[PDB]
Design a protein around this ligand. Structure first.
Ligand SMILES: CC(=O)N[C@H]1[C@H](O[C@@H]2[C@@H](O)[C@H](O)O[C@H](CO)[C@@H]2O)O[C@H](CO)[C@@H](O[C@@H]2O[C@H](CO)[C@H](O)[C@H](O)[C@H]2O[C@@H]2O[C@@H](C)[C@@H](O)[C@@H](O)[C@@H]2O)[C@@H]1O[C@@H]1O[C@@H](C)[C@@H](O)[C@@H](O)[C@@H]1O
Ligand SMILES: CC(=O)N[C@H]1[C@H](O[C@@H]2[C@@H](O)[C@H](O)O[C@H](CO)[C@@H]2O)O[C@H](CO)[C@@H](O[C@@H]2O[C@H](CO)[C@H](O)[C@H](O)[C@H]2O[C@@H]2O[C@@H](C)[C@@H](O)[C@@H](O)[C@@H]2O)[C@@H]1O[C@@H]1O[C@@H](C)[C@@H](O)[C@@H](O)[C@@H]1O
Ligand SMILES: CC(=O)N[C@H]1[C@H](O[C@@H]2[C@@H](O)[C@H](O)O[C@H](CO)[C@@H]2O)O[C@H](CO)[C@@H](O[C@@H]2O[C@H](CO)[C@H](O)[C@H](O)[C@H]2O[C@@H]2O[C@@H](C)[C@@H](O)[C@@H](O)[C@@H]2O)[C@@H]1O[C@@H]1O[C@@H](C)[C@@H](O)[C@@H](O)[C@@H]1O
Lengths: 134, 134, 134
C-alpha cells in the first residue's frame, strides 16, 4: 500500500429532496483507516447518469465533503422550466484536499435545485488518489 | 516506470448505432504490456463533446470494460423527443479496477439510447493511474 | 514530494466572449516550480457549473494548454437556439501530457461557441497527477 487508490461506488439511492447538502449514501471513503494522515488527495465525484424532477428548472447540486465540510460543489440544471422528459445529465466534480487538516473521511453529498427530487438509478463513484505537495 | 500513467486518445469514430456495448475504436489501454499484474487502476473515460441523433429522446450509453466485461457504465440523454439541434453533452465515467482478476486491457465502449446514432468528431480520451489497495 | 499532486481552483471569472482560446484566469499549474522535468501528467480541467449566453445555440469550448499550446479541447452546447434559461452544463476534460517536450506550465482555456458569453460563477478546478511512461 505505498501508493493507495480509494474508491466507492453505488447503483442507486433513495430519491430525496433536500434544501441543504445531505450525504449520498454509500459514496464514502474512510481515509483514516487507509493510514492517510497527511499529503494531498485528488478526489473525483462521478455521477454520470443522474436526473432531477421538479416544476422550476430542475437540477441537482453535488459536493465533495470531508469531516471539515464541503470542499467543492457544482450543479447541473435543465434549460426548460418543465423539460419534456428529464434527461440524463452527466456530472463530475474534482477537488484536491490536504489530509493533515484533520481529514478522516471524504464523502459525496447532494442538494435540490428549486425543490428538485434527486435521482441516481445507475453507477456513481467517489475515487481518490494520494500524492504529496510539490 | 515505477508510477505508470496510461492514456489513449481519438478525434473521431465511424458513426454507428448499436443495441449492445461495442468498442469505441482507439480507446484501448494494453495493461499487460505495461507490466501491471496486480494493484488497482483508476480509469477515466472522457468523451467531452459527443452528440447523438435520433427521433426518441436521443442519447449514448458509455462503458469502461476490461477482458472480464463492463465494470461501469452511464449515459447522457436529451430532454426533448427531437431536440432543435443535438447539442454537445460532455460525458465522464470513472471506475477503479482490481488488475489481479485477469485484466490485460481496459477499453471504452458505447451503445445507442433508443436507436440513436453515436457521434465523436473531436478529442476523447481513456486514461488510467496505477495504485495499490490501502 | 516523491508523488506530487498539483491543483488550482477558482470560483469566478470576468464574463468574456472570445473567438480564440483565452486563459481562464487562475486555472494555472506552474509545473517547472514543482520540479517536474520529465514523465507524464494526467491533467483534469473540471468546470462543473458553467453556462453560456447567446442567440445561436450557445456553448463554450474549453481546452487544456501548455507552453506548447492546446493539448486537448471539447465543448458543451445547448440543444435550443435560445434556451428558455441557460442551464448549468457540467464539463470535464482529461489529457495526459509528456513533460519533457518543454512543458513548464499547464492552463485551462476557453472560447465562445457562436459568440456566446462565457460564465463561471462557482468552483472550477485544474488538477494534475505525475506518473512515468509504462
Ligand atoms: C411516466 C412516463 O411514461 N415516463 C417515461 C417517459 O415518457 C415520455 C413522456 O413523459 C413524454 O413527455 O412523452 C413521451 C412520448 O414518447 C414519453 O412517453 O419515457 C422515458 C423514455 O423516454 C421513460 O424512461 C425510461 O423508462 C425505461 C423503463 O421503461 C428505462 O428505465 C429507461 O432507461 C428510461 O429512460 C431514461 O430515464 C428517463 C428519466 C430519462 O432520463 C431518459 O432520457 C432516460 O433514457 C419514462 O419512464 C419513467 O421514468 C423511468 C426512469 C421509470 O421510473 C418509469 O417507471 C417511468 O415511467
Ligand atoms: C443540417 C444542418 O444544417 N445542421 C446544422 C445546424 O442547423 C440548424 C438546424 O438544424 C436548426 O433547427 O435550425 C438552425 C437555424 O439556425 C440551424 O440551421 O446548425 C449547427 C450549428 O448550429 C450545425 O453544426 C455546426 O456545423 C459546423 C460546420 O458547419 C461545425 O462543425 C459546428 O461545430 C457544428 O455545430 C456543433 O455540432 C452540432 C451537431 C451541435 O452539437 C452544435 O451545438 C455544435 O456546436 C449543423 O450542421 C451539421 O452538423 C455538423 C456536425 C456537420 O456535420 C454539418 O455537415 C451538418 O450540416
Ligand atoms: C433575468 C432573469 O430573471 N433571469 C433568471 C431566470 O429567470 C427566468 C426567465 O429567464 C424564464 O424564461 O422565465 C422564468 C419564469 O420562472 C424565470 O423567471 O431564473 C433563474 C432561476 O431559474 C435565475 O437564476 C438564478 O438566480 C439566482 C439569484 O436570483 C441564483 O444565483 C440561481 O443560482 C440562478 O439560477 C442558476 O443560474 C441560471 C443562469 C441557470 O443556469 C439556472 O438553471 C441555475 O440554477 C435567472 O437570474 C439571472 O441569472 C443569475 C445567474 C443572476 O445573475 C441574476 O442576477 C439574473 O437575474
Amino acid at each position: 500500500g505505498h501508493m493507495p487508490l480509494l474508491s466507492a461506488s453505488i447503483v442507486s439511492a433513495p430519491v430525496v429532496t433536500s434544501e441543504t447538502y445531505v450525504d449520498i449514501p454509500g459514496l464514502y471513503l474512510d481515509v483514516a483507516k487507509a493510514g492517510i494522515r497527511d499529503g494531498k488527495l485528488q478526489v473525483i465525484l462521478n455521477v454520470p447518469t443522474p436526473y432531477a424532477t421538479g416544476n422550476n428548472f430542475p437540477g441537482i447540486y453535488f459536493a465533495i465533503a470531508t469531516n471539515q465540510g464541503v470542499v467543492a460543489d457544482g450543479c447541473f440544471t435543465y434549460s426548460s422550466k418543465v423539460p419534456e422528459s428529464t434527461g440524463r445529465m452527466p456530472f463530475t466534480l474534482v477537488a484536491t484536499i490536504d489530509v493533515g487538516s484533520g481529514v478522516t473521511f471524504v464523502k459525496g453529498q447532494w442538494k435540490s435545485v428549486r425543490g428538485s427530487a434527486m435521482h441516481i438509478d445507475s453507477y456513481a463513484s467517489l475515487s481518490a488518489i494520494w500524492g504529496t505537495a510539490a
